[model samples]
Target chain A: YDDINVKVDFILLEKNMTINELKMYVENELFKFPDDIVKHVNIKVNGSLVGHGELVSIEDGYGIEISSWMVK
Target chain B: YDDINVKVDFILLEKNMTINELKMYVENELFKFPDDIVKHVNIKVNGSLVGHGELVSIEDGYGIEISSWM
Candidate 1:
């Protein structure tokens, strides 16, 4: 039930944003809050903070990939 | 933001139930649904399903102790 998956095909590629940038996009669009709102979001992969991320092209669609991450 | 922490202190110890039994208790009391309702719950600790559970007392307070959970 804690699985949080979001498709960012529409938002990505155009800007070629990194996972850090994707975090901001989720905070702005998914959470939908202005800069004044108090919120802290940490993107995690397998229960750890994402240390790095990659963008991959699968067939014709784009996908965000993760490899190394720091322990939470 | 996906943290789902529930205090089972009020419900544990009274029944001396294991983690498997606690899963049923959560389904019954927390979710508040009858057996007919479709539900499958797995108790997880540190991102893994708890294979065992224990109850203990801590300075006049009760706590569900977890150790050697497979």
Candidate 2:
């Protein structure tokens, strides 16, 4: 709920991969194509489900437009 | 990456759930089952890739005996 734990693959000591490389790899591996999955989204409104979306730095302030949602 | 952006459903306002409740719900929803996709694991050794695991509290310090590994 309130306490959000951030997590990702921790292999800095074992592997030689940059942050971008790691993020890209994890993104590809975790969320497949067509699912349109990305990290950290606001997926609800007034308790109803709204699926996945990312907050963007718009010209105004910020906004989110969903890239994935359930069939039902 | 080093940046390590943390992300979870920011629906606490909508759900009215506690941290434990939200964690449980997310865990079930995300990983599903059998695949054992838990978050944040030390999954490599000298560039060799391992799979998912959890960090646990031991008697003395801390240790991870992979609940799941590649």
TM-scores, chain A, per candidate = 0.29, 0.35
Candidate 2 local lDDT, B1-70, one digit each (tens):
4654332221111124444544454444431122222234435433344444443335443333444434
- Candidate 2 positional error at A23, Å: 33
The DockQ values of the predictions, listed in order, are 0.02, 0.06
Residue A5 in model 2: shift from native, Å? Answer: 33
Task: Give residue A52's lDDT in candidate 1 (0 to 100).
Answer: 34
Error at A34, model 2, angstroms: 24
Task: Write the residue-wise lDDT of candidate 1 on A1-72 in tens digits.
Answer: 223342111011012233344333211111122321111112233333433333233444422333333332
TM-score of chain B of each: 0.28, 0.33
Deviating ranges (above 4 Å) for candidate 2: A1-38, B1-70
Error of 2 at B24 (Å): 32
